[PDB]
Design an enzyme around this catalytic site. Structure first.
Site, PDB file in Angstrom:
ATOM      1  CG  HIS A  57       1.276  12.382  52.775  1.00  0.00           C
ATOM      2  ND1 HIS A  57       0.753  11.136  53.063  1.00  0.00           N
ATOM      3  CD2 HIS A  57       1.324  13.071  53.940  1.00  0.00           C
ATOM      4  CE1 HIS A  57       0.431  11.096  54.353  1.00  0.00           C
ATOM      5  NE2 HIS A  57       0.757  12.283  54.909  1.00  0.00           N
ATOM      6  CG  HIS A 107      -0.576  17.591  53.312  1.00  0.00           C
ATOM      7  ND1 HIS A 107      -1.413  17.856  54.363  1.00  0.00           N
ATOM      8  CD2 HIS A 107       0.583  17.148  53.833  1.00  0.00           C
ATOM      9  CE1 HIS A 107      -0.795  17.558  55.487  1.00  0.00           C
ATOM     10  NE2 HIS A 107       0.464  17.179  55.182  1.00  0.00           N
ATOM     11  CG  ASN A 111      -6.398  17.707  56.825  1.00  0.00           C
ATOM     12  OD1 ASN A 111      -5.843  16.733  56.272  1.00  0.00           O
ATOM     13  ND2 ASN A 111      -6.018  18.952  56.653  1.00  0.00           N
TER      14      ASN A 111
HETATM   15 MG   LIG Z   1       4.845  13.826  57.133  1.00  0.00          MG
HETATM   16 ZN   LIG Z   2       2.099  16.348  56.477  1.00  0.00          ZN
END
Ligand SMILES: [Mg+2]
Ligand SMILES: [Zn+2]
EC number: 3.1.4.53
Length: 329
Positions: free
Chosen positions: A78, A82, A239
């Site tokens: 995160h 990302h 992903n």
């Molecule tokens: Mg989130």
């Molecule tokens: Zn996210």
């Protein structure tokens, strides 16, 4: 007045910005850990958003660098990479033939800005972890979409730093509509909303109207915001739809983050969260359950909505699922 050689190689990677499967890890390396800034800048230039919204380019760069700096580099999944990937994936989903000329420039800005901020200042643990530890964030947001509320507050608060207000030339009417859409999109990235979003997208596929030649009909806010919410949610769970070289790196990173959360849950005697136990983990079985129960029902319904623009993405997802199922010791 000419690019350095690293900036040239970065520029040639960025020619893939309009394609599913951009080498985003390579862009992260070539940009000096500035994937979000350089991908957002490229997309803003490609969609003409600086001229349409009268955004000064130095203000855009200052905001984006500031936003990217509030992603945690010590968080495996995160992080700014990302964020950059979800922005670029949302950028590709907005260009789908079935959605040609459907969305206004303000809705397009809302979807991309939402993507850029949707995980900012993520501490690399879940809502449930923050709730069970009596964390300050869980108390500020009364235990309700704790992270997603925080991502929004930070993304907006950062507009007030020196030369960061990229919305300074929008009318109050534009800013009030932008802000509501951005808030509606990011709150919809909370997985606790997944089943309701998917139910509403399925309903929308059943009653699907189209225009003269392809192109969906969305003639109310409820419908327009539902599609934007599902599109960014699709980008957030994209992903397993990417080439396996990319998917794998995403899987390594999420499992690092989750095992690290599991370590903290163990070393304090809490119930260890699903998939967060590095002792009792089936990564391949986890990925197959994730695709069968969450990612495939979502992407199949999305594929129905934009038939047949998402066929290759659905096929890549099915291939990756077979690949992971084919391992499973
Ligand atoms: Mg989130
Ligand atoms: Zn996210």
């Amino acid at each position: 007045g000419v690019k350095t050689e690293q900036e040239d190689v970065l520029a040639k990677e960025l020619e893939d910005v309009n394609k599913w499967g951009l080498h985003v890890f390579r862009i992260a390396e070539l940009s000096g850990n500035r994937p979000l800034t350089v991908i957002m800048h490229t997309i803003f230039q490609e969609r003409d958003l600086l001229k349409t919204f009268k955004i000064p380019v130095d203000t855009l760069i200052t905001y984006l660098m500031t936003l990217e700096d509030h992603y945690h580099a010590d968080v495996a999944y995160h992080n700014n990479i990302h964020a950059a990937d979800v922005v670029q994936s949302t950028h590709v989903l907005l260009s789908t033939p079935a959605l040609e000329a459907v969305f206004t420039d303000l809705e397009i800005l809302a979807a991309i800005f939402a993507s850029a901020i949707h995980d900012v200042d993520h501490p690399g643990v879940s809502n449930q972890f923050l709730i069970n530890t009596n964390s300050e964030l869980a108390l500020m947001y009364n235990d309700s979409s704790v992270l997603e509320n925080h991502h929004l507050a930070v993304g907006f608060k950062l507009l007030q730093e020196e030369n960061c207000d990229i919305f300074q030339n929008l009318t109050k009417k534009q800013r009030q509509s932008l802000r509501k859409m951005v808030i509606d999109i990011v709150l919809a990235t909370d997985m606790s909303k997944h089943m309701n979003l998917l139910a509403d997208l399925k309903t929308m596929v059943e009653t699907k109207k189209v225009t003269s030649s392809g192109v969906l009909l969305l003639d109310n806010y409820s419908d327009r915001i539902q599609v934007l919410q599902n599109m960014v949610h699709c980008a957030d769970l994209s992903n397993p739809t990417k080439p396996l070289q990319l998917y794998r790196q995403w899987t390594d990173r999420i499992m690092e983050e989750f095992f690290r959360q599991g370590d903290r849950e163990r070393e304090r005697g809490m119930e260890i969260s699903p998939m967060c136990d590095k002792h009792n983990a089936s990564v391949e079985k986890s990925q197959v359950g994730f695709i069968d129960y969450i990612v495939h029902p979502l992407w199949e319904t999305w594929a129905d909505l934009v038939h047949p623009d998402a066929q290759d993405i659905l096929d890549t997802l099915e291939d990756n699922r077979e690949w992971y199922q084919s391992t499973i010791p």
